[PDB]
Amino acid sequence: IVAAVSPAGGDFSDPVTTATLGITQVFWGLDKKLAQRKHFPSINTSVSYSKYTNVLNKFYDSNYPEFPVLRDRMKEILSNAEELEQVVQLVGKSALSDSDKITLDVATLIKEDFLQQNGYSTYDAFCPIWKTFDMMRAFISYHDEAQKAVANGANWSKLADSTGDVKHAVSSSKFFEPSRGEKEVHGEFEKLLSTMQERFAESTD
Amino acid sequence: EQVFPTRMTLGLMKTKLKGANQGYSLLKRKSEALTKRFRDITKRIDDAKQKMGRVMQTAAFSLAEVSYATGENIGYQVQESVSTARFKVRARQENVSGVYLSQFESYIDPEINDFRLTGLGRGGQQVQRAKEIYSRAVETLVELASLQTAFIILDEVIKVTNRRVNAIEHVIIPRTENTIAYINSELDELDREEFYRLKKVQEKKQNETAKLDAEMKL
Amino acid sequence: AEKRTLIAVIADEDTTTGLLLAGIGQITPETQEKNFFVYQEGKTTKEEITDKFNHFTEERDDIAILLINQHIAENIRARVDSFTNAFPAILEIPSKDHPYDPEKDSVLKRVRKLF
């Protein structure tokens, strides 16, 4: 069963929502802000939760061992980005380290590319599990490579100029419509990842 | 003491209170650090200007003395023969603490070598000899100018931040907490009349049922 | 913001000559005009000094540091302290045989207060 509670004005003050939360296992809250900005999937990634993550690892490891750790890393990235945003407004983005800007831009890229999707374009109607896995790998690998590169000493401002190409590549990766090979797409993603590594290595010079 | 939105808006106002507290503390500490760094800039610019006041005089007076020593002051030639500047100015970028500073740097410009003033013989060597000592105060002067600009920028920044903190503390928090109290009072008021109404209906029901079953004993 | 590329001076004859032989004040070939002026104590009118200041500040923005002797700057004290924009640098220096002048420096004057 997939119930659908209706907002009663206040976010959660209504008792029906409290009672449902008391029993329901998976909850997908609503975000006012994203709706105001036409970010159609308005799931708030701060309150929603699901308790079947614990058990689903048994299926995950049989086919895709990397979902748990990668998902946790993405959630940590998003939480860090939002908490930083909490304070950045009161002052301004002037006294920020390279890693801070990296995290902020990565979070923005994920939120505007990974999360967003319109249920009307053919390439975006249904996203298979494997495609989501590969596109997630792309983003997290990009982020960790950038973090490693800056950690060893470099100015991310200069590096970003070179990276713009691969950044656009990963941002456009979603447009790979499924239902073409179901495996050739995986090869394309692997080639993109290898080329990203190569481009960072050469540009890192 | 505000526009009064009474529609279960407590969470929003509490969030505003927390944000106000956080911003207040952060700006307080930022102002502390900026003032601490302002003090040292003041001291160092004072000392640099004071010592330059006499370093320049000794340099220029020695240059004039050597100019007279040859017996032929070269003021006219250096007044008409000079073509291009020996020093160029470049803007220096730096963030002393949080605030980004558009400081100035002593960008020497050796693109033009020492001016071709030597050639008079006795004074040809002495003019360039005293040029170096006369070319020494330029670096101190540009350092002093950079310190002056940094001083002005720091002063205005700290003034702005301090007044903003004072305004926040003395205006925002009272305004929001009074509204908090008002909202709490209204939400406490509603339940009172709701309870009265429920009590009315309950007493009506119990009284009528007791009356109806009273006769049933017979 | 590197439009101000030169340095102007309003100083006595010997100081200006030493400055020129070192060479910072450039006779601008582009304008055929010198941003450095040799001050004649008692001959150059305060109006001319104010005019050259106005040039170097508003019109000839090619000057970064507007140097002037403390004694000479005293004659334009009102002009000196009227202009309080930090983007163009203004430094005051002692004149020929004139010792260090603390009150003649507007920046130092402001420093002493609010301290």
Side-chain angles (χ1 to χ4, degrees), chain B residues 35-49:
Chain B
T35 47
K36 180 173 284 161
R37 288 190 184 271
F38 165 93
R39 302 292 147 197
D40 83 349
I41 281 296
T42 49
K43 296 197 294 289
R44 282 172 60 268
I45 198 167
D46 289 325
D47 285 325
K49 171 164 268 195

Side-chain angles (χ1 to χ4, degrees), chain B residues 82-136:
Chain B
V82 175
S83 314
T84 305
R86 190 171 175 262
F87 171 90
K88 299 289 94 175
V89 295
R90 301 275 299 173
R92 184 184 200 167
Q93 303 330 115
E94 154 170 7
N95 196 309
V96 57
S97 300
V99 65
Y100 208 76
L101 203 59
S102 304
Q103 195 162 7
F104 170 61
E105 53 193 2
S106 190
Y107 168 77
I108 313 306
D109 184 25
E111 73 88 25
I112 188 166
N113 61 5
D114 186 11
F115 184 67
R116 279 76 63 190
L117 201 55
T118 299
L120 306 159
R122 181 180 201 74
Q125 176 191 45
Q126 282 138 4
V127 292
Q128 56 80 23
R129 197 175 188 170
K131 165 162 161 164
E132 191 59 23
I133 180 166
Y134 206 105
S135 304
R136 183 55 39 79

Side-chain angles (χ1 to χ4, degrees), chain A residues 10 13 86-87 90-91 94-95, chain B residues 8 19 23 26-27 30 95 98:
Chain A
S13 59
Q86 172 40 233
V87 67
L90 303 194
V91 165
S94 76
Chain B
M8 191 55 178
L26 296 176
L27 295 176
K30 173 169 171 175
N95 196 309

Side-chain angles (χ1 to χ4, degrees), chain B residues 147-206:
Chain B
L147 295 179
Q148 174 265 353
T149 54
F151 165 88
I152 283 170
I153 295 183
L154 292 177
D155 171 59
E156 58 83 15
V157 162
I158 65 168
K159 177 184 70 185
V160 166
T161 61
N162 192 19
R163 78 162 177 268
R164 168 167 178 73
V165 167
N166 272 314
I168 293 169
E169 161 174 352
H170 269 265
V171 160
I172 293 302
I173 294 90
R175 210 172 44 68
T176 69
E177 57 204 328
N178 301 6
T179 294
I180 290 276
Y182 167 100
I183 296 303
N184 188 352
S185 76
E186 302 320 317
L187 263 66
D188 303 322
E189 175 73 330
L190 273 296
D191 79 350
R192 169 173 299 101
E193 60 80 15
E194 288 303 320
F195 167 94
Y196 168 85
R197 189 176 299 147
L198 189 151
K199 180 70 156 174
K200 182 62 66 68
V201 57
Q202 184 266 329
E203 62 184 345
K204 187 77 72 171
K205 175 190 317 196
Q206 69 86 6

Side-chain angles (χ1 to χ4, degrees), chain C residues 34-45:
Chain C
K34 63 179 58 49
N35 303 129
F36 68 87
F37 171 79
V38 184
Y39 183 66
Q40 300 80 19
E41 305 271 331
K43 194 178 72 202
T44 285
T45 69

